[PDB]
């Protein structure tokens, strides 16, 4: 006649008075252990029990009374986590195994403090792998935590964080309140979080729910991982008693589409358990037995600890199975379970070995214990739709088996993302604008080369013979290079890979500077030669100055290219709202501005050189109003053109920097102005020559 000890929190105040339903259930199991089957061949398993009232002092008193009285006990059963810690941590001294049917505290998972503790109740950190699997199943990586800091949620949140660091999930916030989450859920939509896991009790859960309508934290852009073991209608009860300013309608409205992950305490299948009945049959029998105790559960008002009755039933059945295996192994000799004392280490170790290797289908499912005494449970996932919970699936934590019933109803038909994904788009010059500018530049190159070919008459006719043809050839060759630079100025990153874009960026500046220098070695230096000839009153004195200007600006450009080039300075802009997509994609523009380290220094140096030459040429042409010379006969035209070229170059560079952030207009002006600067300065010089040469 084996005896066991049980501690059941029945008649207490506060805490978890779960014995009210967990005491009768064990009794039922007791019958099903000893009355019907041959589970104990010649033994009747008895249970001595007393109330603990969910406090550790009375639990210790009950344990002392049980362990220091005449009927010898072989095992201790305990309820809440406080009593479970009080008994299990002190149980090794008496060589007793403590099986707890309602201890969900994660702090009980350390075998060092509790060497003989088994819990048929799943630990509070059993949903965390399921939450992480759900996060990795919908592609979410940015999640937030809303704690309550009750010394039990801290451990669960720590476990969740440590498991997240092994899954790549990034946690944005760890907001934790104590009684009022107003200043804890408000900051949730500051580090804007869409996926939020709630780690609070039902009393705080209702208040958190009420504190996410006026903050508008619900809808299509947010998903809540609530705790799954609340009451089914946990949002429409205890309203007036609490300071819930919200209403039942809005209570339900934002409960839509939140996922709850729970530890399974009832067998979801219809299979017959080892007890000889199914989960529904045991539920009906427990309902029949509980009404005798003084409960009116026919019209609801369920007793406390109702959901954990299968845990107590399976705890008793696990005790019986372990004892049966213990006597089966102990028959190889003379020692028996009846002759057990608190100083008998071998029998206690054998019972521990038997309770380690337990694997049976009970009312709560496949009951087995992990290496640290925790209950190996199959997690269950459900979602609230229109104020009702629909089961999305189940998850096996030990081996990755996510049995999914595709019944998740995401609003909008698509899984919400964990953030507002930003896409960077490169703003480019308009294709028709670039094509038109390229065609105009090609026409300019064609006409320039046409004049270069037409310069064949240099010896044939005196009009070009006495016009210093080498200077005109230099001018045209500079015009061609500068027009090519204009073409290269429209080639943005849309047309070239970014890894080679700096090559085009550097080539643009090099070609533009070289072209301008060659176009003012003939538009200004010829005027300088005219002025000097007039004052002092032939070909080396012009080409040498051209070569000197080319030498200095080539040195400047080479130093710019080698010492400090430009790569990319893609700018930004306000986060634009894109076309109708009904989704959170934020499109941000980026330009392709060039910028070197000391871009101001290089640009100022080059622009000062150009401006000095421009002002020199303008003033020389001012002094070159009417000093017409025989051998430089086109001294009045190539001066007439200096005025317009100077005004164009003094009107383009200033406003160009102002509009440089506008991709289209800046390119359009810097192209059209150069087109004119190369068109009038070409016509004024060469069309009179063509008119005079043939007539």
């Amino acid at each position: 006649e084996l005896h066991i000890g049980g501690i059941f929190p029945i008649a207490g105040k506060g805490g978890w008075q779960g014995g009210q339903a967990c005491m009768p259930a064990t009794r039922l199991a007791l019958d099903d252990v000893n009355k019907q089957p041959n589970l104990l061949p010649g033994f009747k398993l008895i249970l001595h029990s007393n109330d603990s009232e969910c406090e550790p002092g009375l639990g210790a008193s009950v344990m002392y009374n049980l362990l220091y009285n005449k009927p010898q006990k072989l095992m201790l059963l305990a309820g809440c986590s406080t009593v479970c810690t009080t008994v299990a941590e002190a149980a090794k001294m008496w060589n007793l195994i403590v099986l707890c049917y309602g201890a969900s505290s994660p702090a009980l998972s350390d075998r060092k403090r509790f060497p003989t503790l088994f819990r048929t109740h799943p630990s509070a950190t059993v949903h965390n792998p399921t939450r992480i699997k759900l996060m990795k199943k919908f592609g979410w990586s940015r999640v937030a935590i809303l704690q309550q800091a009750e010394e039990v949620f801290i451990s669960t949140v720590e476990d969740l964080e440590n498991r997240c660091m092994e899954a790549g999930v990034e946690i944005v916030t760890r907001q934790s309140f104590l009684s009022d989450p107003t200043d804890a859920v408000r900051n949730l939509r500051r580090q804007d979080a869409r996926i939020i896991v709630g780690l609070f009790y039902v009393v705080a859960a209702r208040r958190v729910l009420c504190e996410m309508y006026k903050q508008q934290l619900y809808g299509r852009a947010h998903v809540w991982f609530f705790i799954g073991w609340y009451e089914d209608n946990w949002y429409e009860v205890n309203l007036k008693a609490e300071g819930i300013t919200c209403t039942v309608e809005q209570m339900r409205i934002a409960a839509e589409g939140h996922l709850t992950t729970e530890a399974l305490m009832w067998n979801q299948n219809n299979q017959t358990t080892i007890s000889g009945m199914t989960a529904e049959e045991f539920r009906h029998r427990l309902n029949q037995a509980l009404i005798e105790e003084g409960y009116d559960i026919n019209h609801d008002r369920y007793p406390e600890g109702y959901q954990e009755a299968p845990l107590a039933y399976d705890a008793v059945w696990s005790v019986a199975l372990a004892f049966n295996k213990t006597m089966e192994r102990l028959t190889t000799g003379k020692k028996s379970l009846r002759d057990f004392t608190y100083t008998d280490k071998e029998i206690a170790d054998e019972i521990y070995a038997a309770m380690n290797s337990t694997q049976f289908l009970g009312v709560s499912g496949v009951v087995a214990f992990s290496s640290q005494g925790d209950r190996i449970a199959l997690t269950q996932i459900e979602q609230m739709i229109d104020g009702k919970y629909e089961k999305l699936g189940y998850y096996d934590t030990q081996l990755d088996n996510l049995s999914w019933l595709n019944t998740e109803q995401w609003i909008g038909g698509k899984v919400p993302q964990d953030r507002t994904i930003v896409t960077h788009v490169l703003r480019t010059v308009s294709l028709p604008l670039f094509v038109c500018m390229c065609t105009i530049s090609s026409c300019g190159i064609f006409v320039a080369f046409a004049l270069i070919i037409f310069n064949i008459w240099n010896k044939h006719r005196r009009v070009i013979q006495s016009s210093h043809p080498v200077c005109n050839t230099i001018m045209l060759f500079g015009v061609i290079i500068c027009l090519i630079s204009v073409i290269l100025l429209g080639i943005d990153g849309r047309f070239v890979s970014p890894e080679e874009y700096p090559k085009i960026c550097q080539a643009r500046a090099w070609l533009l500077s070289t072209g301008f220098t060659l176009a003012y070695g003939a538009m200004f230096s010829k005027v300088w030669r005219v002025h000097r000839f007039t004052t002092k009153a032939e070909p080396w004195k012009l080409y040498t100055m051209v070569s000197g200007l080319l030498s200095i600006d080539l040195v400047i450009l080479l130093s710019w290219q080698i010492f400090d080039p430009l790569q990319r300075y893609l700018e930004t802009f306000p986060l634009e709202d894109p076309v109708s997509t009904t989704d959170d994609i934020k499109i941000r523009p980026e330009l392709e501005h060039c910028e070197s380290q000391r871009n101001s220094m290089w640009l100022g140096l080059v622009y000062g050189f150009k401006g000095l030459i421009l002002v020199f040429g303008l003033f020389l042409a001012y002094e070159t109003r009417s000093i017409k010379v025989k051998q430089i006969n086109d001294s009045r035209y190539v001066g007439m053109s200096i005025y317009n070229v100077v005004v164009l170059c003094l009107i383009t560079a200033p406003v160009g920097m102002v509009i440089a952030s506008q991709q289209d207009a800046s390119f359009a002006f810097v192209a059209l102005a150069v087109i004119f600067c190369c068109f009038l300065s070409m016509l004024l010089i060469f069309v009179p020559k063509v008119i005079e040469v043939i007539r």
């Binding site: 550790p56 002092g57 009375l58 210790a60 002392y64 941590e89 001294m93 403090r113 002002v615 003033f619």
Partner: protein, 661 residues
């Protein structure tokens, strides 16, 4: 005539915290012998301590407690365990036996009255270390303290009470660091702010690690002051366990640190309830203790005496102590509770008297000086008083306590009369020379001077030369010599007069150069025309862009610039400089072109060219140093005033009338 008490000790062999059990048992025997050998304290009674060895285990302690409850003589009180995780289960379990528990060595800051009504503490908790440290912050003026504490609860609630208590005393927390295993990161975070006084809550190993890092990163001393609780072992810094820092290395960072610890015995000459002073009891304990020692020996002696007092009170009130003692009967506990609330007696550790449930005991305060831990003083908690004169004097690194907030003063710059007075004297001599040359030009209409360059333009260039000196004096003036409200005007005087100096000096040469230019192949108004190009734009300075000085205090090592307007300068000043440079390069180029042209009726053109060349080079250098080397106004002035005066003197000497015999 035999009253029993139940005791729990960490005894026997190698168990953790065993020294606290084997070092207090001699004191327990001493107190039992003194109580039994004493009259008028308890008669027809004999206090017997039934004690069990709780091997630092929460299970062994509970089993021993249940064993002494189930069998043996009725124990009337519990002598609490010296380990928190051992006494906490006993404290929770004994509440249903209606027993009063008295602790002798447990300092954990969680055994409050609300959670443990029957747990009285002769030894004060760690919270009792808050008051002395915060007292020192009042003794030496430190109103800015940083806090680093171990995340364990034993070093968490005392820190919370401290940061909630120093708030009322106008002391501001700068930072709060709570490490777990790495203290170096906490120290780096603390140094991120400029905090010098640190309050630390950690165990001896973590104290060694913290000072290891406080050497690794420089917090050794003479500027950083430490204030930590030090209920550690003797010579804890001498144990080699930190990050490779030797004993001769962990001590350097420990120098000048103030440590608060539990006072083992009262240093006053008061006579205890045993009839012997604390020194006689110390002699007896040292004689009967052998090699084992613990700081709680006086505390457990006083605990046994308090238990005897409580039993005497219970006997006086309830006569049926030994014939009606029932665990299940509640009122007994209440009586003992009252007996433990009327306890007020002088013991070997001071006035024992329970206030809420704990005891206010004197706090020893010592300081690491010259490679040794020397006592500094005592903080009496009954009458809160920081007696700092009892021990050795407080030895500071240097002569002054470390400052809570680093102080570096900053007062302007640009000064040293000399740099300015010599420049003012040079400008006075320069304007004297300019006036002398003007007088020498006044004797016009005499041969060559009549036929030379226009003497009117000479008076204009001389006026320019003098106004350049006026410009350098006006520009050099600072805000320490004049009213600060006059800063814009002088800034305007910095600009306008300077723009005048270029107009009336460079323009005079420019007019002659333009004449020579018009010659190679009614007139001085060009200078005025040039004046226009500046005066109008200077008005656009005042009308829409009021001057606002920018005070930038940069690298104030063991000074702030007072520059001009904080307005558009790269748009405005750049334009002025570009226009001046255009004029300079124009003049230089025409002078180069007009080199050897004699062209009478306007003489000394070559000297005008030389003057324009030196003006070009000096102005280029001055602009470069002004736009680049703008570190402080003193250096700018000492670099530019000499150049300005040299160039101006060259201009007024080369062209005026050099010798002309």
């Amino acid at each position: 005539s035999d009253v029993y008490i139940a005791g729990f000790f960490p005894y026997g062999d190698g168990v953790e915290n065993s020294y606290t059990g084997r070092g207090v048992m001699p004191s327990v025997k001493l107190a039992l012998g003194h109580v039994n050998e004493h009259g008028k304290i308890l008669a027809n009674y004999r206090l017997h301590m039934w004690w069990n060895d709780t091997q630092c285990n929460a299970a062994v302690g509970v089993k021993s407690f249940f064993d002494m409850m189930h069998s043996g003589p009725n124990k009337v009180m519990l002598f609490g365990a010296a380990c928190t995780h051992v006494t906490d289960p006993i404290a929770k379990a004994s509440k249903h036996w209606h027993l009063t528990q008295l602790s002798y060595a447990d300092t954990h800051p969680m055994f409050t009255k609300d959670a443990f009504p029957n747990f009285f503490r002769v030894v004060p908790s760690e919270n009792a270390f808050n008051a002395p440290r915060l007292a020192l912050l009042k003794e030496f003026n430190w109103t800015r303290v940083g806090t680093v504490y171990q995340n364990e609860p034993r070093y968490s609630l005392p820190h919370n009470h401290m940061v909630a208590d120093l708030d009322a005393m106008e002391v501001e927390v700068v930072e709060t660091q709570s490490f777990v295993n790495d203290v170096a990161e906490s120290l780096k975070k603390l140094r991120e702010k400029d905090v010098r006084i640190i309050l630390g809550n950690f165990n001896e190993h973590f104290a060694r690690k913290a000072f290891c890092e406080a050497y690794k990163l420089d917090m050794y001393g003479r500027a950083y002051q430490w204030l930590i609780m030090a209920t550690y072992s003797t010579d804890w810094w001498n144990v080699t366990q930190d990050s490779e820092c030797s004993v001769e290395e962990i001590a350097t960072a420990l120098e000048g640190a103030i440590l608060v610890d539990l006072l083992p015995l009262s240093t006053s000459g008061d006579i205890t309830v045993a009839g012997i002073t604390a020194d006689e009891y110390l002699v007896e304990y040292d004689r009967l203790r052998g090699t084992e020692y613990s700081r709680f020996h006086g505390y457990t002696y006083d605990g046994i005496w308090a238990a005897a007092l409580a039993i005497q009170y219970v006997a006086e009130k309830r006569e049926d102590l030994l014939t009606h003692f029932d665990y299940r009967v509640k009122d007994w506990e209440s009586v003992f509770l009252e007996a433990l609330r009327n306890t007020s007696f002088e013991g070997v550790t001071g006035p024992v008297r329970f206030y809420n449930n704990e005891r206010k005991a004197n706090i020893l305060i010592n300081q690491f000086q010259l490679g040794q831990m020397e006592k500094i003083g005592e903080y009496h908690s009954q009458k809160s008083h920081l007696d700092l004169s009892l021990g050795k004097p407080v030895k500071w690194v240097g002569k002054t306590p470390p400052k809570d907030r680093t102080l570096i003063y900053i007062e302007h710059s640009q000064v040293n009369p000399t740099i300015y007075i010599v420049s003012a004297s040079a400008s006075v001599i320069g304007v004297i020379i300019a006036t002398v040359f003007l007088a020498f030009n006044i004797k016009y209409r005499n041969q060559r001077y009549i036929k030379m360059s226009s003497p009117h333009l000479n008076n204009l260039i001389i006026v320019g030369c003098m106004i350049t000196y006026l410009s350098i004096i006006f520009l050099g003036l600072d805000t320490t010599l004049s009213s600060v409200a006059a800063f814009p005007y002088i800034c305007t005087a910095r600009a306008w007069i300077l723009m005048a100096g270029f107009s009336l000096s460079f323009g005079a040469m420019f007019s002659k150069t333009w004449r020579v230019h018009s010659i190679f192949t009614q007139l001085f108004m060009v200078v005025g025309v040039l004046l226009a190009i500046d005066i109008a734009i200077i008005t656009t300075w005042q009308i829409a862009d009021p001057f606002y000085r920018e005070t930038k205090q940069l690298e104030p090592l063991h000074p702030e610039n007072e520059y001009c307007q904080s307005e558009h300068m790269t748009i405005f000043v750049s334009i002025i400089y570009a226009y001046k440079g255009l004029l300079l390069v124009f003049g230089a180029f025409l002078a180069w072109e007009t080199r050897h042209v004699s062209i009478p009726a306007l003489n000394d053109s070559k000297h005008i060219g030389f003057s324009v060349y030196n003006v070009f080079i000096t102005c280029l250098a001055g602009a470069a140093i002004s736009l680049v080397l703008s570190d402080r106004k003193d250096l700018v002035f000492v670099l530019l005033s000499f150049f300005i005066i040299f160039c101006t003197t060259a201009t007024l000497c080369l062209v005026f009338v050099p010798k002309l015999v």
